[PDB]
């Protein structure tokens, strides 16, 4: 096998996921990436991380995988405004623990380039409120304003796919009430960033202070690479 195909239409204990940090799944099926604490209030300075079990194969050899992946999830704070730090969709080594926390995302560790990072990310940073597409660097390779201090607090549904005869990377945001879109798209080459196989999956740090906390929990999930 070289296709990996998914569908979680929910969250439960007994599936194919990989917990770190403080990711948990509640007991209505969601998965809470930073956590809620002994209170059942969010965690402040937490860092939780979830991919899918088993790895990925990106590079077959000379073929490289075309994936689609579409996910939606919920950020609520006590203060949007001044919520920190945001949820990402990563491909990752395939057992790398958690990296740092708070802007870091928990998969980067410096302000420098971290080639040997091997990690691709799309994060969607409540932090400066935008949407980064992260290339083993912290700093984005291209970024799109998103106002989530103002459109957060509802479920939002993104979608993600990557073309490897175009080499292009699109990210397809919609909050659903209040109907708000954004979109980044970027010009990759995978095989030149990550490894043949990878670990799929989200990575989301919160704030830390109450005030700047914030919940991260994606409430489904899909994905289908596909070597053409
Ligand atoms: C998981 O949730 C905990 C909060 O509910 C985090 O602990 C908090 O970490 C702060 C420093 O990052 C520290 O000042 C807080 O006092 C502490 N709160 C509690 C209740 O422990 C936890 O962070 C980890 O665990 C703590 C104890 C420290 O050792 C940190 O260095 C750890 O990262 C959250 N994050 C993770 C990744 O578990």
Excluded: M
Excluded at 201 to 211: I, M, N
């Amino acid at each position: 096998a070289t296709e990996t195909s998914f569908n979680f239409p929910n969250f439960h204990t007994d599936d194919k996921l990989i917990l770190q940090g403080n990711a948990t799944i509640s007991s209505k099926g969601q998965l809470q990436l930073t956590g809620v604490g002994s209170n059942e209030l969010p965690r402040v300075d937490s860092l939780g991380r979830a991919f899918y079990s088993d790895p990925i194969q990106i590079k077959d050899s000379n073929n490289v995988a075309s994936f689609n992946t579409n996910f939606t999830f919920i950020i609520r704070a006590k203060n949007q405004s001044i919520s920190a730090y945001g949820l990402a969709f990563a491909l990752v080594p395939v057992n790398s623990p958690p990296q740092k926390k708070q802007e870091f995302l928990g998969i980067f560790n410096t302000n420098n380039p971290e080639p040997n990072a091997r990690t691709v990310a799309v994060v969607f940073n409540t932090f400066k409120n935008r949407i980064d597409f992260d290339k083993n660097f912290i700093k984005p390779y291209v970024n799109e304003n998103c106002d989530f201090h103002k459109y957060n607090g509802e479920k939002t549904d993104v979608q993600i796919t990557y073309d490897s005869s175009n080499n292009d990377l699109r990210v397809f945001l919609h909050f659903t009430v209040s109907q708000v879109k954004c979109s980044v798209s970027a010009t990759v080459h995978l095989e030149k960033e990550v490894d043949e196989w990878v670990s799929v999956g989200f990575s989301p740090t919160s704030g830390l202070t109450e005030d700047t906390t914030e919940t991260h929990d994606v409430l489904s999930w899909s994905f289908s690479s596909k070597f053409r």
